[PDB]
Subunit: 459 residues, 2 copies
């Protein structure tokens, strides 16, 4: 039976607002939480009722207050909590505590949150399921001949990483065999000097990939569907900037192989609810790299090309409904379709002329464009608002759909342009630069785009 | 260009919450007004701001205080007012004051309101546009032989009415020539000067949605079928009409466009017709939005309220912002049905029940729109307004499916603490005559079972 009368969103800003709408639409009452920091936040007011959480804790911590949140749910007849993204949404402790208190958790099961929070467990999950992964040594290599033969087996470019460098430091790229001997000896002595261990791993470098992600929905009855892919190749220093759906110049036969790859893995683990599978792509090959056991900021553009409300589905799936049930109403795979293109970006208070440091303060004048095929998910982008340093400094999330990619791009550019802000800086001039650039407009581009095109940083 | 940054909704309940949605989806800030009575009304908390209006007036008059509404709008920097339906939404003096105070009126011009708020002025605009109307004597008849001849030209059945009387209190049907002699004779004695009209009996009731811009552009969004009526009240609307020919559909829609173009109508409006076989007849223009507007949005995929706001902001029908395709490219897909759940107890003559809702749960889901009025747990339903719990609209690829969803969702409502009309709504939507897709305005009033429970 449907149990969910009232839902609490344990989150803030645009994604809280997003789930409030989904709830109201479904006839479900809502509960927002806010920190002292958010006593003036827009989201506090878009819920049917709001309660202060994590009092005396810090700005970020007050949303991590697992016991105070749950104390609120039980205190006000909450049946289920939506975790949105990016706070407790992937936290195992939260989910099982909900389960103990008899509060439903909109999201997959804990063994899902665990298996996909560990890169090793996931890598194993994917190989078990028959999906390709990026070739790497499992431990640190024994010696030079190992790196040589790894390279003979997988082809350069390769990359050698210090063991204790963790991620992101003590890494060395090798493009040729004439390059490997010195590059290895060096990678040892340098990791030993900087971290204290000479141990290094090797990986296959998949260079300048397209970053392709697939949306997934599973019910408790084992049904799985993909809502096709979103293209997240437009990135600055590896952080997402503009997502496109579907991927413009992705082979449609390649589109197929990828998506099936994603369902085959999620079915093999019986993923329940909403989740995404990420791949890196080069030519005809693709490699699994991550699963996000939750919804994502950019879910919007898939909803637009498919016509499926993803957040409404999350809730219904959480109350026991199946993907093809009357209420969820998602069709069989072969009848799900994409129509046109959709693009998203996120207007922030990041000052591109100040190393993108987030500006703070009070927005004196605020006005936006909007319209058909335009979607305005506001964070705290409104006139008179007070933007603090504590959070995601997100003014509004902007999603634009049109029949043709070219059209979707004009729509985005035109609506970034229609914005009038007074009182704080924003990242609009950079967003403007990115989506107006011939390379993006070409539909054909990979993850090296932004980092490699310097004119994007002239204002 | 565009000037709308803030809109006040001069209304309450579902229609005001519906416009609050559109506004937010456009980056537009929202203000609500509530009467003292609606101090715990849901819509008050759904707007960005909210101010008590008409304090010290009756409940209805509260939402009729033009000067109190203007005041709130000026004091709070409102650029435009949405009247919704059913209060000041057709009030020429309301639109006049807005223009006066340079406040945009989300709706057509004052002359549109005037000509279409009068049956005579309306009939003349329809006629002057080449649109068929229902036959009548342009004045009182001179004697019996004129009635005879009127019916010979237009055909029985005819209707005889008194002048000092009015529609209803002074009206008599005549089906054959045998009656006219005695009927005409009676009408003269009873009414004690008479008029004659053709009777369009058991007509289907079809209305066409129209939109126009300040550039002179006009599109229809096809028709809604409102035949299903209890005592001429609308109970269940369907779109598109299930058993209405395409030729006839096309003919009826063009009639609506032709007529609205000829008057330069602007913003949202509806042209009502009565259809009989292959003939149809103009009867009314609703120069505002209607309750049923949901089901037309659903089949066409066009957001009418948002188009309303953008059109009043100067935006062209086919501009980037409004985004409506060429008339020829506008399509309909699937079917949509609307129902309104109220506290009308059909076991107490449909008298509106009041009180505190102790328990409330509804269904919901894909293809289901819930436009809440005051149907929520812990709500207190007063006898003063529309007494609406929730306006229910369902869409599906086929009519049968859309009917089943509507029926299925009605059955999921759990309401404890007060009566509703779901018992009637269910009987109506489950009946095979309605499911057949082939019914007219006589359906409800000639099917008694609908009132057994």
């Amino acid at each position: 039976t449907r149990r969910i009368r009232k839902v609490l969103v344990a989150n803030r800003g645009e994604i809280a607002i997003r789930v409030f709408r989904a709830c109201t639409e479904l006839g479900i009452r809502t509960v927002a939480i806010y920190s002292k920091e958010d006593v003036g936040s827009y989201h506090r007011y878009k819920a049917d009722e709001a309660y202060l959480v994590g009092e005396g804790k810090k700005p970020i911590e007050a949303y991590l207050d697992i016991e105070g949140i749950i104390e609120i749910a039980k205190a006000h007849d909450v049946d289920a909590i939506h975790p949105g993204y990016g706070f407790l949404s992937e936290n195992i402790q939260f989910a099982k505590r909900c389960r103990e208190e008899g509060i439903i958790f909109i999201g997959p099961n804990e063994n899902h949150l665990d298996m996909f929070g560990d890169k090793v467990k996931a890598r194993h999950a994917a190989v078990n399921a028959g999906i390709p992964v990026i070739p790497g040594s499992d431990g640190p290599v024994d010696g030079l001949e190992d790196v040589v033969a790894f390279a003979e087996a997988h082809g350069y470019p390769i990359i050698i990483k210090a063991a204790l460098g963790g991620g992101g430091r003590g890494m060395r790229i090798v493009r040729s065999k004439s390059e490997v001997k010195e590059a290895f000896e060096r990678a040892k002595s340098e990791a030993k000097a900087a971290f204290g261990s000479d141990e290094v791993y090797v990986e296959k470098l998949i260079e300048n990939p397209k970053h392709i992600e697939v949306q997934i929905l599973g019910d408790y009855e084992g049904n799985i569907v993909h809502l096709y892919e979103r293209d997240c190749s437009v990135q600055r220093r590896h952080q997402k900037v503009v997502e496109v759906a579907p991927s413009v110049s992705l082979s449609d036969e390649l589109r197929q192989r990828i998506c099936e790859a994603a369902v085959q893995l999620m079915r093999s683990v019986g993923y329940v609810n909403a989740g995404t599978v990420e791949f890196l792509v080069s030519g005809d090959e693709f490699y699994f790299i991550e699963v996000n056991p939750r919804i994502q900021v950019e879910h919007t553009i898939t909803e637009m090309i498919t016509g499926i409300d993803i957040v409404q589905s999350q809730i219904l799936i959480a109350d026991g409904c199946s993907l093809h049930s009357h209420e969820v109403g998602i069709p069989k795979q072969e009848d799900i379709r994409i129509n046109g293109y959709a693009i998203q970006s996120r207007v922030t208070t990041e000052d591109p002329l100040n190393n993108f440091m987030p500006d703070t303060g009070k927005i004196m004048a605020y006005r936006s464009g909007g319209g058909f095929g335009v979607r305005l998910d506001a964070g705290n982008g409104f006139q008179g608002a007070v933007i603090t340093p504590y959070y995601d400094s997100l003014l509004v999330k902007l999603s634009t759909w049109a029949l043709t990619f070219e059209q979707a791009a004009r729509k985005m550019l035109r609506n970034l342009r229609e914005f009038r802000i007074r009182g704080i800086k924003t990242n609009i001039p950079f967003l403007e630069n990115v989506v107006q650039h011939p390379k993006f407009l070409s539909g054909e581009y990979d993850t090296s785009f932004i980092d490699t095109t310097p004119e994007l940083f002239v204002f």
